Design a protein around this ligand. Structure first.
Ligand code: NA
Length: 98
């Protein structure tokens, strides 16, 4: 058996074909086992509608998840990604910078 704690990165991107659109992204990387729970949060509340959840693996024991959706951030709102995995004794919450 092998188990590996996910690396978690939270960031925003504008698709170049539609620059007015903005996406909030949580990239959860290099984890094992694949069992996982991942949410985007707005002001502590789970965002229910997340349009994209893309899972892949490299080696059989290394998984990668890109979890993202369109959003409209204001200066006041706080966004975060919350991840639960067997390697994390408590949920890990990573704040979006900006
Ligand atoms: Na856990």
């Amino acid at each position: 058996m092998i188990q590996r704690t996910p690396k978690i990165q939270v960031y925003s991107r504008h698709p170049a074909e539609n620059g007015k659109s903005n996406f909030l992204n949580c990239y959860v990387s290099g984890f094992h086992p694949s069992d996982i729970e991942v949410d985007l949060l707005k002001n502590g509340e789970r965002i229910e509608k997340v349009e994209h959840s893309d899972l892949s693996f490299s080696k059989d024991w290394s998984f990668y998840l890109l979890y993202y959706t369109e959003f409209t951030p204001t200066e006041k709102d706080e966004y975060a990604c919350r991840v639960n995995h067997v390697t994390l004794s408590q949920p890990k919450i990573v704040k979006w910078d900006r």
